[model samples]
Target: DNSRYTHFLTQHYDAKPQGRDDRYCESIMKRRGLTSPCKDINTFIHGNKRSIKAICENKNGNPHRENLRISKSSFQVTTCKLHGGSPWPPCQYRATAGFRNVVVACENGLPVHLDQSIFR
Candidate 1:
């Protein structure tokens, strides 16, 4: 009952957001296995069925705007004791590049990653 809901500025948030196609996005998703939903983030892509093929594999032989925003969105987490919180938990271990990626984080050290959700 001591956590406060707040958000921090995104590092690369742009008003004129760029688009990324499925090929580019699928690579990232496969790279990070962002396909699976975890924590508070889910790496899903949303678009019209009409554009699914184009978004997945561009057969037009021409590059088009991606159906996704390649930008990352994050949030803020409060520190323990500062506002009546418990001890911080250890960072989760993630596998990347065939190595274990230890998510080292302390108070405000974590970066919240957001992607398209099923609700979309």
Candidate 2:
């Protein structure tokens, strides 16, 4: 449910666009508490919860870990995948340079959040 994605929703996923800087991941990871040597790829869904929930109810909707193939118009999503193989205190990330459909998990009759990208 939307409840399950509370964290993802609050941190990575959002209905609105957030202004990010050149060091977006660096700052965001630390501020979002994803630091501590940093993490690998983290997915962010740029869309509102209400609209996402609606998608969950229709257009092949379902609850609890449902994989929905939504068009790009539905929402904009981004992922911060780690690179450089660097160690802690200075973990590096390389943002992917393309947009692709993502695999999101739905629950409680609403779209919770994204799971991974449908790489092609």
Best by TM-score: 2
| Poorest stretch of ten by lDDT in candidate 1 | 96-105
**lDDT tens digits by residue: candidate 1, 19-103:** 3332433333334433333222222223222222222232212222342222121211111111112222221222111111111
lDDT scores of the candidates, listed in order: 0.23, 0.56
**Residue 57 C-alpha lDDT in model 2:** 54
Error (Å) of candidate 2 at residue 15 is: 4.1
Candidate 1, position 4, lDDT: 16
TM, every model = 0.22, 0.66
lDDT of 2 by residue, 30-93 (tens): 6777767677767666655665555555554333344553533345655566667665657666
